[PDB]
Design a protein around this nucleic acid. Sequence first.
RNA 1: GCCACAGAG
Lengths: 334, 92, 102, 69, 49, 49, 243, 50, 49, 45, 389
Amino acid sequence: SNIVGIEYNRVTNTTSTDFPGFSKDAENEWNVEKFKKDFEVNISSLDAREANFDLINIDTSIANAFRRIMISEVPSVAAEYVYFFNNTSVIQDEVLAHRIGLVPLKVDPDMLTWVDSNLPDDEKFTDENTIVLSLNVKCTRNPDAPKGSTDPKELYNNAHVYARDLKFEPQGRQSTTFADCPVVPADPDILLAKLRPGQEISLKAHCILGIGGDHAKFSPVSTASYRLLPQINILQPIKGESARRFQKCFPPGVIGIDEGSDEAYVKDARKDTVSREVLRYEEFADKVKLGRVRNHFIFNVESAGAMTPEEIFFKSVRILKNKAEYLKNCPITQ
Amino acid sequence: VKPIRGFCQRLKGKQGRFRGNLSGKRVDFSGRTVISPDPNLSIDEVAVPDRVAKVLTYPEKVTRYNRHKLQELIVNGPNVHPGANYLLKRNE
Amino acid sequence: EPDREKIKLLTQATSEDGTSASFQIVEEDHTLGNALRYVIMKNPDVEFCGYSIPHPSENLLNIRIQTYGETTAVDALQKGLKDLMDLCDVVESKFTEKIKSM
Amino acid sequence: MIVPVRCFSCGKVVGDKWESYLNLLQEDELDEGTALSRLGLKRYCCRRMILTHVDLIEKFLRYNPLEKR
Amino acid sequence: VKTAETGYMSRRLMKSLEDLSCQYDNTVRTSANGIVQFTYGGDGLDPLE
Amino acid sequence: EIALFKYRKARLEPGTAIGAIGAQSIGEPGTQMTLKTFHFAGVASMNVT
Amino acid sequence: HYAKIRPWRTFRLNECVCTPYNADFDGDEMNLHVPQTEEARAEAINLMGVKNNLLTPKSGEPIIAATQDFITGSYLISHKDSFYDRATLTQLLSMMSDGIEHFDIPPPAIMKPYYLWTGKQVFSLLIKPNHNSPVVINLDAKNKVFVPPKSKSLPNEMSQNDGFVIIRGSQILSGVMDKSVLGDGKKHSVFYTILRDYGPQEAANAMNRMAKLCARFLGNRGFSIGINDVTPADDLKQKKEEL
Amino acid sequence: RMPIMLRSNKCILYDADESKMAKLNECPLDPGGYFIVNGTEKVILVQEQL
Amino acid sequence: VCINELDNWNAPLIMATCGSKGSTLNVSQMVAVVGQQIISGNRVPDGFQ
Amino acid sequence: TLKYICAECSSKLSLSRTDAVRCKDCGHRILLKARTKRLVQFEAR
Amino acid sequence: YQCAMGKQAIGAIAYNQFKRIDTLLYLMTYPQQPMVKTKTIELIDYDKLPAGQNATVAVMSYSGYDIEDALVLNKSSIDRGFGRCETRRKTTTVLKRYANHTQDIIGGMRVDENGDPIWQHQSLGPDGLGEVGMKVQSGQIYINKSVPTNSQTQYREAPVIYRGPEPSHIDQVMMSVSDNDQALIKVLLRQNRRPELGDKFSSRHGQKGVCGIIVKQEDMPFNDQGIVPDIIMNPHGFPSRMTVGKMIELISGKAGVLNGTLEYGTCFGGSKLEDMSKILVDQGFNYSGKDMLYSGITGECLQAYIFFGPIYYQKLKHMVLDKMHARARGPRAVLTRQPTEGRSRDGGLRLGEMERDCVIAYGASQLLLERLMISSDAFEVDVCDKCGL
RNA sequence: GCCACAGAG
Ligand SMILES: CCC[C@@H](C)[C@H]1CC[C@H]2[C@@H]3[C@H](O)C[C@@H]4C[C@H](O)CC[C@]4(C)[C@H]3C[C@H](O)[C@]12C
Ligand SMILES: [Mg+2]
Ligand SMILES: [Zn+2]
Ligand SMILES: [Zn+2]
Ligand SMILES: [Zn+2]
């Protein structure tokens, strides 16, 4: 069986059992034809910032590897160094630099090159491996503000420094390479700082590309996780008022009562967040059992705005394949 | 009036010569740090920070069995951790 | 040109005939060790495959493969890497055709 | 002191939701539990990011040294 | 408050018991070579072993 | 053979600072002891210290 | 201790060793002295070593043994309803030895439906990994919570809840592993037997294997406490009220 | 010269609104009740006697 | 009556059975009656008249 | 070079060699050094 | 213990905390008000200036690094600002006027041959006081004080040199005149600190603990929605200490953040558990707050439900950066010729009577001789064999 | 340098 059973106090059968040596039959050898026949992908939603798709008949290790590579191995572009000219705000320079490094940039990671660390700073950053973002905001008192007003958006001119103030400054051939895709933040309304008259911010941010393992600002996904497909089995029919109570143990769209026989049946097990509430009540014992399909993953990949989630998943699969190929091509030193 | 520190006051008490400087005393080559768990170390091992390890030194005498090792440690120097901080010559 | 420092065969743990072996792989973690473990355990000749990260401070992974007398552990490791490549290729193909389907 | 750019747990950008959350509480007179859901903060880790945030920057800016108070 | 008295008790006990040791003829003696016990505990057995 | 080996290795080895060991093995339970109220064999009017 | 060099600005010791120090990782600061002569170094490592001081001199009982979160994981492995297939068995065996030690997989306790190894066989391999290991220890001991069997004529191992542990050869034939068998204070523990019969190095190796296994197993087999574990049932609030 | 306790009836911060607190570089949520002597803010602690 | 009713896989019960942390008394105090408070061997002294 | 800020009236002012340490537009005797004009580099982490 | 450790939590001090120059001030970058409040919290205005953050806690045994009160932190959570803090310190100097009509001076900047300041004066500025906003490393000067020698007079150099394990940035420079008409200069230095191994965290029910390991987000457990805990706490801290109020706080906070309102943990009252269970079950979660988490290492479902929810954690002022010390050889006292006391003087650790006696108990004669004579106060002396003097 | 309190385990 491949159903992770859910009980009132424990979770049973959580480990994969598809390998020879599990039993005397010695089946489930690795056959690429059988895996090609059995594996399935079903995309249910595909937006510009979020993808939902089911991977069916795949092992837990590979799906978890895809999730981990998506979170911490797919590169993305974020601000790395900040050079300050006259930051006169209340917000400290470290805090402002950290906030600017945390904004997501709408930059294709494949248009850049990895920065060589051992090179010195005079020639480390070139036009191929660094995006320059200049910010320059000065706040002044509004001379014609209403007398009865108290909103800082009306009393002052530039009291709110947002992420859209991060102008892009092309350097060298980036004037032609980034002509049709200018560098803008993925979330332009990020509130970076607040000012009062007499204060000024001006800075240049050098943005390179890195992986999420080095720092969380480089992770291309705001979230990237799966969940097993829930499975509700009603072993005995549930009739009448109890069925209504049986409806209240689940989210509203999960199960329904048929109008003819007046019995409860499972309508949509995907909506069922496994709260196992129905296991609290003694009347539904030996009448319903809950489980999750162990090899049926529902990935929900939300991008940070730099690039599409399907590209992120494809890059994760390619990274795992390249890891395997690189390990295969290496010589084994004794 | 604060009573003067006479000769008997220098010898009695926990801050006197006998209990503060003779029975127990402050020592060199010691460090103090907050402790945190690490189950991957063996039970007969303690993990020392590399910052501390670059200060706490061991004086190894050069023999015919460890000449090249100490040459490499001298070459590495005080900043690279597998190194050395001081050298004392035989005739100096 | 080849990366000699990537994967090593720990001599002190392997067997004389190469049936049992332990390999040290640099700059990996659970995301590759678990996939290799699952793929190698599907080899009918492998009776022991297990990875470990000896210390979080070290970016390192020790994987032990013990087989029967039919094949050596190096052959099992190469077969597992090739089979993981094939799995990734199949997943890649299915995903890229279901994108174009809708 | 100011609303953080990203959620600590997952990584969703919540720094651009502070002004909208204040506007939905003040103008539309919505309750605090519905304004969060209208902004797409479904996970509770993102909800606590701006539900428990204390905007101390406004209080700190009253003591501006660059301009008479 | 119990540590304040316990430390003094331990210090007194050790300053009274530090000099004793088991000699090579299995007799426990003081630093002035005077016998306290002819055999340790009556049988000369280590509590640790 | 096992019994004789265990007996012959259980003797107190000469040179052991057994007085310091005893002083510590008496002082340390004094640290571990919590202060409780006891009575002498089932009558509540004694309160033996 | 033998020194290791790590970059994280704190002294780190195995949690089996914090019991002689009476130390907890809640802000404790400790001291580190370095002997500067060969005689002092040898005397420190041969008279004050951790391996040579597994037993307190106050009573002779072990003082360096399994602490909290290592007893619980070992108990959950050695629980009676713990059955592992060959993949999980092998991963657990590699988890206690950094993927270096050679393991001789014993025949499974269940054969016809599937091939399943009990966690007591996992700890039998923990005590003695292969045929080249010399550790062969035999002992009988009672657990902390021992429920006597139904009849007084029956032996102690035929009790309920695996109260009695029996180790013959190196196989754990009965019982669970708890503070009585793996912890400190009792002279019938596994590590005490290994230290007395085969020297301190094998006891240290077994403790290291146990710590490395239980530091990686309980994360992948979760263990949690909630208010559901603390709330009383419905009838208890009436029985307590009436009493 | 008597060193006056902050937020007493002889202090400058007595019954002052938040704007005057901002004008004097003083926090409105400061508890008060201490003396500023030589720049250091010292509190006369409550004594318990028979 | 509290301890005998708690089901298996109860975390305080497991931690008490192991001896890793806690005891039966702590579980009984958390789930059921805390019990009499004892000060210096007696009950609570008359703080007031 | 204007380098100092009066802590009360917030007026940028400079001090010569013989000038007293006090503001010129008011009697306040507390002066804060203004921020330097030289480049300061930070790592966005 | 909570009453003891609440006064050491790092957080906002006052509204004028950036206009203050205090001798030591710990501030938190992103403070949050507690999810589970109290009427006393509202009455004393603690929620206006809170000290702590609401961390997603999964009460489970994750690694071996959470044993004995130690806590597991999330590296990605720390990278996004969890537990980030700063330390501000004050250095004050007085340009006193001596009775000989001579006074201290501040100016001076030793420029090199090329036309740039020297390394020790790299951030010292033309007026002698270090520039606001620049980074000061160990060995550099931020106050270039000079003292007349006779107290055309000659001034000897007595600068104020920064020294410490990590660099600091000059946050504020202030000059004024005291009552006795002597110039007063105050320099406030700030340095930003992130959580590391050894940093102390408290959980507002006692339950103090230092960080034992910092692991990546993908190594952490996760729920169906992808929520990753910021702090993993060992289950073994509850039974011996019996903090049921902590579990009630977790459930109240979870139900409040799902419902959108702050909850109350008021003594002899507060938000009842049944209402929070109803709120949790209406939102699709378990009534007891026990979620089902997949482990990030192997991907499989955990075989036990994990107590999962927000807990208010406090970062205490005790950080390992201020505690680490090591001596080797250094200064010695003039009287006893033994190592000095304290890490401020590069002192040595005392091997007291108890440690001496512990070394005696092992029988280590040569180790005792080395520790108490060779490495502390060894001295070659000449003694007369006849008179014994 | 001497006192004085304040904390840490
Ligand atoms: C150098 C690496 C290039 C790589 C990142 C580029 C080159 C080939 C590209 C894919 C193909 O276009 C087919 C698909 C088209 C859909 O629209 C979006 C997804 C889809 C899988 C693509 C993703 C991505 O854009 C790829 C892999
Ligand atoms: Mg402690
Ligand atoms: Zn979030
Ligand atoms: Zn002025
Ligand atoms: Zn003489």
